[PDB]
Structure formats: structure tokens, C-alpha cells
């Protein structure tokens with residue numbers, strides 16, 4: 285019942301079952317990551333002018349992908365802004381949980397918001413790709429040997445000139461624990477760039493962070509270049 289127990293039990297299935305351990309933890313209720321809401325830094329950036337420039341540039345077909353959406357809080361936020369948003373998670377339970385949590389959302393009924401059980405590493409990239417991708421508590425969930433494929437998949441999922449927002453969390457330092465892995469902007473930079481493929485347009489410390497997130501989180505905005 286203790287959070288530390290739930291993390292220890294979670295890290296035990298990931299060692300025994302691997303990627304299939306995520307749907308196991310979702311249906312078993314062991315979801316110590318679920319905060320019920322989007323992180324404040326995401327809203328403040330979008331409502332800022334540095335973020336406004338992206339929301340006003342938004343075309344009438346701007347597509348947003350939220351890998352590892354969980355219950356799809358961030359995905360529902362981007363749909364509320366007018367984006368054709370897709371929430372993708374490996375767990376079919378989580379996708380079913382997101383569809384209940386946002387059942388009354390006008391965007392789920394209209395189709396702007398969509399929740400699908402997809403594999404970030406396996407699903408077919410749409411031809412038009414994605415104008416924006418948001419990664420929170422997904423890169424830090426992947427084991428270290430999957431970060432390079434993560435950045436490789438991000439290079440093809442984001443269209444040229446598109447945006448990849450990465451809320452780097454948790455920035456805990458030398459903590460060698462499993463999920464959630466301690467990450468920094470450097471680890472995200474190495475995975476994304478294999479000035480090769482991306483441009484770090486913004487790297488900021490969020491003004492309004494969750495209290496447990498203070499000092500362990502940075503919002504980084506990447507642009508896909510040629």
C-alpha cells in the first residue's frame with residue numbers, strides 16, 4: 285500500500301515481464317504515477333507567449349501525439365486547445381481507463397481526442413506525421429537501453445518544423461533506480477540527436493511546478509529540423 289512498496293512491486297514485474305508488465309500494473313491498480321491532472325508547467329507554457337506562438341501557428345489539421353498517455357490528462361488538454369490529439373499507451377486497461385475518465389469530454393465525442401492501445405515503438409507513423417508531440421513520464425519510464433530507439437522514433441514521428449515538448453522529470457541525479465528513471469536534459473539530448481536532427485528552442489525551469497516536482501523538473505521545447 286505504501287508508495288515505496290508500489291514502486292518496488294512495479295520494478296519487480298518490469299524485471300520479470302518486461303514491457304507487458306505495464307498492462308499488469310494498470311489492471312492491478314499499482315499506478316503510483318497517476319496524478320489525476322496535467323502538470324502545471326504544460327498549461328503555463330501553452331498560455332505563455334512562447335507557447336502562444338505554437339497555438340496560433342496551429343493549422344486546421346494540427347495533429348498531437350501523447351505517447352504513454354496513461355489516463356490521458358495531457359492528451360485531453362491538447363484536444364481542448366483544438367488539436368486533433370491522439371493518446372497512445374501500451375496498456376489496454378489504461379486506454380479503457382482514459383476513455384472512462386474523459387467520457388464526458390466534448391473532444392472524445394467529437395473525435396478531436398482519441399485513445400488507442402498502441403506501441404510507441406511499433407505503430408505505423410501516419411504519412412503527415414505529427415505537428416506536436418508531448419513526452420511526460422514516458423522517457424523516464426523507459427529502461428536506459430530504449431532511450432536511443434525512443435529518440436529515433438521521435439525523429440520520424442515529428443514532422444519537419446514540428447515541435448516536441450519534453451517535461452524532463454524526474455531530474456534526481458545519480459539515482460540508479462528503475463522506473464521512474466533519473467534523467468536530465470543531457471540524456472534527452474543524446475537520445476534525440478543520435479544540431480543534427482533537432483533544435484533546442486527552449487530550455488526553462490518552470491515557474492509553477494508541482495511541489496514534489498520543484499527542483500527536479502525542466503521544460504524543454506525541441507523543433508524538428510532537416
Ligand SMILES: Nc1ncnc2c1ncn2[C@@H]1O[C@H](C[C@@H](N)CC[C@H](N)C(=O)O)[C@@H](O)[C@H]1O
Nearest residue numbers: 306317352353354373374375403404420421425
Ligand atoms: N512502448 C510503449 N508504448 C506506449 N506506451 C507505453 C510503452 N511502454 C510503456 N508505456 C506506457 O507508459 C505509461 C507510463 C506511466 N508512468 C504513465 C505516465 C503517464 N504519462 C501519466 O502521466 O500518467 C504506462 O501507461 C505504460 O503503459
Ligand SMILES: Cc1cc(C)c(S(=O)(=O)O)c(C)c1
Nearest residue numbers: 291316317421424425463464
Ligand atoms: C513510470 C513512473 C513510475 C512512477 C512510480 C512514478 S512516481 O510518481 O512515483 O514518481 C513516475 C513519475 C513514473
